[PDB]
From a paper:
We have obtained a new crystal structure of human [name] containing both functional domains at 1.85 Å in the presence of ATP. Unlike all previously reported Hsp70-ATP structures, this new [name]-ATP structure, [name]-[name], has an entirely wild-type (WT) NBD. Besides the N-terminal signal sequence and C-terminal unstructured region, this new [name] structure carries only one modification from the WT form, the L3,4′ modification (L3,4 was replaced with a shortened sequence: TASDNQP → VGG). In sharp contrast, L1,2 in [name]-[name] surprisingly closed onto the polypeptide-binding site, packing against β3 and β4, which form the bottom of the polypeptide-binding pocket. The residues lining the polypeptide-binding pocket become packed against each other and appear to exclude any substrate binding. In the [name]-[name] structure, due to the packing of L1,2 against β4, the distance between V429 and T462 is quite close (4.4 Å for cβ). This strong quenching induced by ATP not only provides support for the presence of the fully closed conformation of L1,2 in solution, but also suggests that this conformation is the major conformation for the ATP-bound state.
As the most abundant molecular chaperones across all kingdoms of life, [name] are the key players in every aspect of cellular protein homeostasis, including protein folding, assembly, transportation across membranes, degradation, and quality control. The SBD is the site where polypeptide substrates bind in extended conformation in all the processes of protein homeostasis.
Residue numbers in the entry:
A (entry chain A), B (entry chain B): 24 to 629
Write the structure that this text describes.
Amino acid sequence: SEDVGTVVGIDLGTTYSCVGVFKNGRVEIIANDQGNRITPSYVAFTPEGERLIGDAAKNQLTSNPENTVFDAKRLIGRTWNDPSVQQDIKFLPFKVVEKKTKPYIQVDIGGGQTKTFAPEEISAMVLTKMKETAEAYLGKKVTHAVVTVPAYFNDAQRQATKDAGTIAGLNVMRIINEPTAAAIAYGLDKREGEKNILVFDLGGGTFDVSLLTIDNGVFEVVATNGDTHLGGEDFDQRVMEHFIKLYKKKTGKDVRKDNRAVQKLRREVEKAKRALSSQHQARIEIESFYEGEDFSETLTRAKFEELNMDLFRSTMKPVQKVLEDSDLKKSDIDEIVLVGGSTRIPKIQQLVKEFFNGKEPSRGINPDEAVAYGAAVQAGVLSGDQDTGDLVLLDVCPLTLGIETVGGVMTKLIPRNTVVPTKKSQIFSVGGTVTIKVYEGERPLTKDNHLLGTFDLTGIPPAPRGVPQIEVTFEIDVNGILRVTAEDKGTGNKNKITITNDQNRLTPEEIERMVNDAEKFAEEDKKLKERIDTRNELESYAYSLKNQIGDKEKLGGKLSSEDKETMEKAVEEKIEWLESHQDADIEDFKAKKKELEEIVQPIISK
Amino acid sequence: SEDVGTVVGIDLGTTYSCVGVFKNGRVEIIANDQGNRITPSYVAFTPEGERLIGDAAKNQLTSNPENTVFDAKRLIGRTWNDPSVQQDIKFLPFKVVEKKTKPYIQVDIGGGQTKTFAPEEISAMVLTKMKETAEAYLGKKVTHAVVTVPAYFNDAQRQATKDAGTIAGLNVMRIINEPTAAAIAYGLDKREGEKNILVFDLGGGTFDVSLLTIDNGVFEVVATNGDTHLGGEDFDQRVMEHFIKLYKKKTGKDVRKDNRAVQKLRREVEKAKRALSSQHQARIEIESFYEGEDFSETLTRAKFEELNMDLFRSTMKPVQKVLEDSDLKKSDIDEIVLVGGSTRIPKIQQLVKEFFNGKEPSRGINPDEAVAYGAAVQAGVLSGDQDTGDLVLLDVCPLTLGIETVGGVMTKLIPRNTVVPTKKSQIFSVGGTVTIKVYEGERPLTKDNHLLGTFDLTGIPPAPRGVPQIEVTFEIDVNGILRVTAEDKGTGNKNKITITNDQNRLTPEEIERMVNDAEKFAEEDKKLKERIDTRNELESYAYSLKNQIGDKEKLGGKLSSEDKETMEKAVEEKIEWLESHQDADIEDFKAKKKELEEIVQPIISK
Ligand SMILES: Nc1ncnc2c1ncn2[C@@H]1O[C@H](COP(=O)(O)OP(=O)(O)OP(=O)(O)O)[C@@H](O)[C@H]1O
Ligand SMILES: Nc1ncnc2c1ncn2[C@@H]1O[C@H](COP(=O)(O)OP(=O)(O)OP(=O)(O)O)[C@@H](O)[C@H]1O
């Protein structure tokens, strides 16, 4: 069977991502090359064409706002005409343009070239950085992964996330819903009897609530609901609007035409928001904010709350929906599990606590890392060779699926909160071409909901005297993704044929072109890391020699006058060279190291 | 048997204190009347003579620095000539004076009176505030408690902490060492097999390390070591000294003479220190800092680390000591548990991780609350009627005890890290009067260590022809406190008489006077809470009526013109009165409420 190697769990988040592995009976949340256990979901292309991902990309955002990309999770799997897309792109500094029917991110990638990237490709870059982080930690290549999605992601958003994994060179063995992952983190070693757990997940871009039953490693989602365009970024944007208006009232200046100013303001607003989770006021100060003038304003917690109060209060509606859908009352909830960084907000914690009549949330749960933690546990299970303890997951589809047959019935097919995998079939006996539209959502008229896709039954061949009997099967798989197949029942013949969605999902050929593109940049990453590693080696070697020569009681005391002169000359020459050749290639660093060695050795070996 | 009621667990900390209870199978960490689950270990007396404790005391520190008291845990149980006391009092703004050979805190308590308080009385006020917090949450009186102490507290510091509990009206059922409490928090529900746990506890004033073995609710400390004058406050003081020097060089001004300036600087330094645990830079700004001039400086994380590098590095020595005393090597440690707020410092976490060759600390442990959590669990066990699961604790004495008998031998008695309770006896056959000094510490000459106390055997019978046989017993009890008793073996008699320590600890009579004093203030607290509660009732009633009268589609629409006028008038009159009588007594609020009611009822009942 396939060697899946070490399987990693990746929480692919709107603003931050996080990767973990299950090793030696425990989860390791893996720190990146800057020592951070979470990584900004940012990518950028420098003026010289270098691809940056993560902390480096975020760090140069204000200097390069149009070619820095973030919040791609708010675009992934969506179409151009999605009202959410059209609202969000107004506030993103990078260009987003329509290609056929989808939002593509357009940036300058160097060499005078402009490139348009599918959101899948941007998210694949983030996944690649998480993969690189894991590989660095493990000292070996990673090929397989469990990747998270919001529970309320629709079919296309799920498929697009899986495609991002493929483009990053990952076999995505499982797409896991974020609250379900957090539930595993909470409950893996719990031995407290069967309990109802409410997971309240409010991150940087999305909001999910799921109600689970948990009993000794058996986890079942009973109901889920959410909002895929509600999270910390929206709270930031409410504050930014406030201060842009305030600044215009105070100075007469509208700074929105200035990307650099707006992004400096965004950076400080984010820091202020975080401060306000433990302070009651925060000062926002920006030196030479706009046209030379300084910015200095105070944001009180009360104002932050006021600016966001409708958004904060709206998180209670999905809680009420999952309680109703689970046939439970408030008091039936045994534990409340808060995850996602925005659950650090005091007004959020208060709203949830008050909703549940004073019941306090479960403790010891890191809201930034719990999702990655659970993903890592499921990855450990799928690895096969781990001591995870037993783990059984039963999850559900978030949206009612219904179909509209042109010239046929329109009907509900699979209700929301149905345990997956699940399937439903429909017989078509009409003959000729059959066209079926699939919709997702809870409005009573099926076609008033979100269009998932259009599926055509082309080849129903004759059936002399007999009745046409085409069975179409709609199956939602364990990843929450729909596959439509058809088989002729009248023929008896066995071949189920997959019907492709007319709505233009990435094809395997398109995906492979994106993979090849990604692999070019990955090769650059590899060579850069090797180059920097050998530069670091030369640097440490030279400075070490410098210290030894200066030690009068060891080597510096053993060296003759003459040899000591020669040694110092050689080492200081190499250090000078280093200071002026930081950008040299691997070969040059190696060669300078060996020159220095061939000078030093006949001397120290005396 | 005694009804111990609901037993609370109180972490009595240098800078913050925290109280928990075990109810319904879980620990509740109890929020105070300001919603905070930790409370500043601060007390103050307002110019009008009101005693403030906790958040209110800390809030007015800069306006009243000489009559605000904090860091009493660095004085409790110590003598005047203790080098630690003499060093610390130089940086405390309140007066500390010598009496009973001890440091007493001298403050103005109002009415033109100056009072000197034992450190035990100050800590008793903090314990009283924690008690009040618990009673508010529980809706009933609390009489019994488990109170924490640093593992490395000596005999007198332990006894003084217990006495503080008594003065606060608490029967302290157990004194529990802070790392042992943290270990219970970590391991209560763990089912991972026998493991060695290293608890590294760095709080606001003290540092403890303990190595434990844990196996399914059996917790045994193998070795412990620490520093009772090393913690967050010291790091703050290093930064303080830095900026006072910097300000003097910059302006020529020495602000040390100005208590208000110094305490503003301290407040902002504490804020900055906390910021630097997640940022690399922090801005310290104080408006009208000194003689009208503003303060504005930046503290980098690198500078904070440099200012404290010797202190940070010194925490590794106790780790090495407990590893050696446990006969273990670094790799034998299965879990590292960090507790105490100062373990949030990145350089600290780095030093610990590097010491243990990359081993990461256990996750999901709140460093501010874990000690109170464990104390709450042990309190739950002592309550008797809780479902805590089984819990067995074996703890040790931190210091070697030895004795010096005047005219007799000097000898080690009880080695450090001996499991307690434990006892050791010595026979004296000399007759006359026997004087025994008891010393604590590890220096090879017993009397070079810390003097615990002096004990005299007065009544030794000279029995006819037979030789005197007085057995003196030195017992360390389960609280870690020494009791010295004597019995006559030659007599035969079984009556063991307790020998009182000449180094006079508080006597029961002195303690009861302190209790009576505390109880007067507690009565003031009670009356204030009642008064404020009824003022709040009148307020809410009046404003409620205001809202109802303005509701045109219910009461406002029901009321006649006339009656509405009378209603509005009555309510507005009462609100005016409230706005000018915030300081009215209880019966006045009651009377105004009753008057308003008597006006409103004949009208709304139409
Ligand atoms: N102390 C804090 N106070 C308020 N908000 C915070 C705090 N810390 C982090 N956040 C917010 O949390 C968000 C990031 O949370 P996290 O990374 O857990 O979610 P995510 O995985 O990015 O989002 P999603 O799951 O929605 O894709 C950011 O919006 C950030 O501003
Ligand atoms: N983020 C942070 N970075 C640095 N220090 C912090 C941080 N948060 C809290 N501290 C420090 O932690 C200390 C308080 O810790 P905590 O209350 O757990 O200990 P304590 O019980 O007061 O002290 P002790 O046990 O020594 O008597 C204070 O010195 C505080 O400044």
